[PDB]
Structure formats: C-alpha cells, structure tokens
C-alpha cells in the first residue's frame, strides 16, 4: 500500500488483539500510544517508570498485543496508554514491523 | 531517496534560507518546529495566539527550504525552547512529495 504525506492526518486502521483501532502515523515517536478513551476497560495496564519526552511514568499495556493489518500481517507491540489524547499514535515500534518506508519521487 | 522506518530516528538535513538544519521526520505534526537553541538570533520571531497541543513563537518570515537535490519551497516554522531535536512536519514533508509505502 501507498500513502502520500499531505496536510491531512496520515492514518492507519488495524487490530490490536480482537479490537479495531485507527491512529495517526507518528514517525516522531519510538513507541505506540493508545488514548485512554479507546483503551478497552477489561485490558490490564500497569505503571511504568519510563519517561516520554513529548508525560512522565505513563501507563502501559500489561500484555503484549498482537497487531494485525488488513492483509493479515501481524506482530506484537506493547503500547503506552495516555489520558487526555485526541488520537492514537502509531510509533516506529509498529511502523518498523510493518516494513513501512518513506520515499520521494525525488 | 528512500528511508526505511526503523528504531533509529528518521532524519533529514536541509537548508532554511542560508543555514543548515538537521531534524526528525515528524509525520504526526502539521507544522515544522525548530529548537530556539538552533534559531539564528538575527532572524525575527513573533508571538502567536495559536496553541500546539502553548502560545509558541513562530518565524516572522517564510523561510525557503532547500534539499541536497535543490528541491525548494516555503515553510514558516514555530520556534520552541527545550526540545532535543528539530521536527520536520507535514508542511515540509508534503512539499517534498514524500510517500509512505509498504512491500
């Protein structure tokens, strides 16, 4: 698949375990973030002593989540779960497993 | 050019007017941000009443961006203290006609 970068939000829709999520492609971030409002209440989260330069000691998924795209590619991520975010943010942890590259005509 | 996305910071080096800057490709941002620490003191910046999710400074002028293949255009970045890296937003990336692709 191909997605030009424009003024519009670059987005991907995929599954984490059994649930569909939509998020912003976020090359700027090492790690994936799910906004607390999209986080399934029954899925366990845990404190971390990680710090995110961009929210200190954020929550993270207790378990690894199986990501799956619409072509049935899959892998594991363990996202951070952050309160008061407008959008999910797909980081380079996920993007790299989907073998996504950036290219210019030139 | 082609750059796989990996754990390493995806970076671009280019000119804004006469000066070289290096930064992180930041698809998540509408607008480009330059570290106040890298910002030439003689280049004017202005208050805004915009918030970036606050009241940040922005370049008073449009800056001519130029890459190493001599593609060019205009951006007007925000200028923010206390960031570790410059951040290339979609204002710049869209003018460079950058695509994301997967095998």
């Amino acid at each position: 698949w191909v997605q030009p970068i424009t003024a519009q939000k670059p987005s991907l829709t995929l599954w984490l375990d059994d649930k569909m999520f939509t998020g912003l492609i976020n090359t700027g971030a090492d790690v994936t973030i799910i906004k607390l409002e999209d986080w399934p209440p029954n899925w366990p989260i845990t404190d971390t002593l990680t710090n995110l330069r961009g929210s200190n000691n954020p929550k993270q998924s207790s378990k690894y989540l199986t990501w799956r795209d619409k072509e049935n590619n899959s892998g594991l991520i363990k996202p951070f779960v952050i309160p008061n975010l407008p959008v999910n943010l797909w980081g380079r942890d996920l993007l790299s497993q989907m073998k996504i590259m950036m290219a210019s005509p030139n | 050019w082609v750059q796989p996305i990996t754990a390493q910071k995806p970076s671009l080096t280019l000119w804004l007017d006469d000066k070289m800057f290096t930064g992180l490709i930041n698809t998540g941002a509408d607008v480009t941000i330059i570290k106040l620490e890298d910002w030439p003191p003689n280049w004017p910046i202005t208050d805004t009443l915009t918030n970036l999710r606050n009241n940040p400074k922005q370049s008073s002028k449009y800056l001519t961006w130029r890459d190493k293949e001599n593609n060019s255009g205009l951006i007007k970045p925000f200028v923010i203290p206390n960031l570790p890296v410059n951040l290339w937003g979609r204002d710049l990336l869209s003018q460079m006609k950058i695509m994301m692709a997967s095998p």
Partner: peptide
Amino acid sequence: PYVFAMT
C-alpha cells in the same frame, strides 16, 4: 496545530 516526538 497538533504536534504529536518522544524517546
């Protein structure tokens, strides 16, 4: 404008 970086 929304600005989504972090180590």
